[PDB]
Design a protein around this ligand. Structure first.
Ligand SMILES: [Mg+2]
Length: 492
């Protein structure tokens, strides 16, 4: 059949959004539309809300509008000059800013407009100063300086104002309200994992082992069928007809995040069940160190203690730093009565973790080694990569009191897929706990945890840190070049 103009990237975006129609915890998502015969004005996908959705802003928002830049396998970059050039959205006629202005006249005041691209903002392009790290919103306080066209912001104002045949910067401000640029959005491959993860959670079938993805077909079929928009009733109707309904066992959705809130992920849990740390730091995340222990740790503990004493089942959406994921695990540990479903979200993509699926994996390889007389111990988990060298360097250089490095590598070596599931993660966790308890640390001593693992494994290991006493958690940071080095984060 005839592809969508946005092709499979656009269909997958559509599927993630359409999923909300069958999600009981987002009952306010009342329609999802696509336009596959485009591009037009910010309507590649539209998601409509009733009641209008929660906003950062002063008005509850009736719909999100998406213009999606044609995915290419080769990464590119773009700047403020690209927003007035049609070539960039790959038409001969109307620029994204022209489509925005167009969309701003036809659509209700309380609308949000999003340019979606896998590309990044060029280094030091003024666009990067006017696009919020939090939510991609245009930063109007930064673009509208009160300066004249001569300023660094002025040049951007002037290119855009004159492109849109507007007379004043005040009118350019009005057209740019509700505009968002979502840069470095997930790859096509990662979008496939985002679809599957969204579909499993709402109790639909996934498509895993195949190299063709059944929903890219179903998308094309829906186009030839001329079915472009779906209510909650219409989407459920569709799921029945296609035989997609697997079932769901209801968890409270909770969200812990410390990176950019892309609109794909921003509504994962209600706001009272969402802790977005980059938000709290107005888009400027502190370096690893005492601010983590003094400000972040209380924010996380207070929030997850709130969850723990009301919720018996938690679907924790996790997109955060390693030591925060590990802190999350401690607050919602073994001993707490919380059944946990983990949704691990990052740039590689989305996966679901639980202790449901079984495993008979070999014990991890555990090598201990002596480096001094001191009573402190390091445990180094090399799960994604080999962490020991860089841990050893940091420890020799900075931790005299450390006497023993316990190193933990999975059976089949470190690598993307080195841990199978939650039950394997939990096994390694117990295995590490036994080892660390068997090592008989005195009480006044500290266990130093160096982890190179994805969020879920750090969470499960965090679940066992009650058993290991005084613990120091570490962040691996690339502030020592391509090399990188470890800094201490949380002391628990
Ligand atoms: Mg488009």
């Amino acid at each position: 059949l005839a592809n969508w103009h946005g092709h499979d990237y656009q269909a997958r975006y559509f599927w993630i959004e359409a999923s909300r129609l069958k999600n009981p915890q987002q009952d306010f998502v009342v329609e999802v539309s696509y336009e596959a015969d485009g591009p037009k004005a910010f309507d590649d996908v539209i998601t409509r809300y009733n009641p209008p959705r929660r906003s950062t802003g002063p008005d509850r928002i009736q719909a999100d509008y998406y213009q999606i830049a044609f995915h290419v396998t080769q990464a590119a970059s773009f700047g403020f000059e690209d927003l007035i050039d049609p070539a960039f959205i790959g038409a001969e006629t109307f620029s994204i800013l022209e489509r925005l202005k167009q969309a701003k006249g036809t659509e209700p005041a309380n609308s949000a407009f999003h340019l979606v691209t896998t590309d990044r903002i060029i280094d030091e392009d003024p666009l990067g100063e006017i696009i919020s790290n939090v939510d991609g919103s245009i930063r109007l306080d930064k673009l509208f300086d009160g300066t004249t066209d001569r300023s660094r912001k002025g040049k951007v104002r002037k290119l855009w104002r004159q492109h849109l045949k507007l007379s004043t910067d005040q009118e350019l401000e009005q057209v740019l309200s509700g505009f968002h640029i979502q840069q470095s959005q997930p790859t096509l491959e990662a979008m496939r994992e985002k679809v599957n993860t969204c579909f499993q959670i709402i109790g639909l079938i996934t498509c895993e082992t195949s190299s063709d993805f059944r929903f890219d077909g179903a998308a094309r079929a829906l186009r030839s069928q001329e079915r472009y928009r779906f209510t909650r009733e219409q989407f459920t109707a569709l799921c029945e007809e296609e035989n997609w309904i697997r079932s769901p066992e209801s968890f409270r959705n909770v969200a812990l995040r410390s990176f950019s809130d892309g609109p794909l992920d921003i509504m994962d849990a209600l706001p009272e069940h969402t802790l977005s740390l980059l938000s709290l730091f107005e888009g400027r995340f502190p370096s690893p160190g005492i601010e983590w222990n003094d400000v972040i740790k209380p924010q996380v503990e207070t929030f997850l203690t709130g969850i723990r004493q009301t919720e018996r089942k938690v679907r924790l959406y996790l997109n955060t730093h390693s030591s925060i994921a590990m802190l999350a695990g401690k607050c919602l540990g073994h001993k707490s009565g919380v059944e946990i479903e983990l949704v691990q979200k990052g740039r590689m993509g989305d996966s679901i973790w639980s202790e449901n699926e079984s495993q008979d994996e070999p014990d991890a390889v555990i090598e201990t080694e002596t480096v001094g007389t001191g009573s402190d111990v390091a445990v180094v988990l090399s799960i994604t990569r080999n962490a020991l060298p860089k841990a050893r360097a940091y420890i020799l250089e900075n931790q005299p009191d450390i006497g023993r490095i316990i190193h933990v590598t999975p059976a089949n070596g470190h690598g993307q897929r080195s841990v199978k599931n939650g039950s394997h993660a939990v096994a390694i966790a117990e295995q590490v706990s036994d080892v660390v308890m068997d090592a008989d640390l005195p009480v006044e001593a500290s266990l130093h945890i160096f982890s190179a693992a994805p969020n879920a494994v750090n969470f499960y290991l965090g679940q066992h840190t009650d058993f290991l006493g005084t613990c120091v958690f570490y962040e691996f940071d690339f502030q020592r070049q391509r090399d990188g080095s470890y800094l201490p984060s949380f002391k628990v």
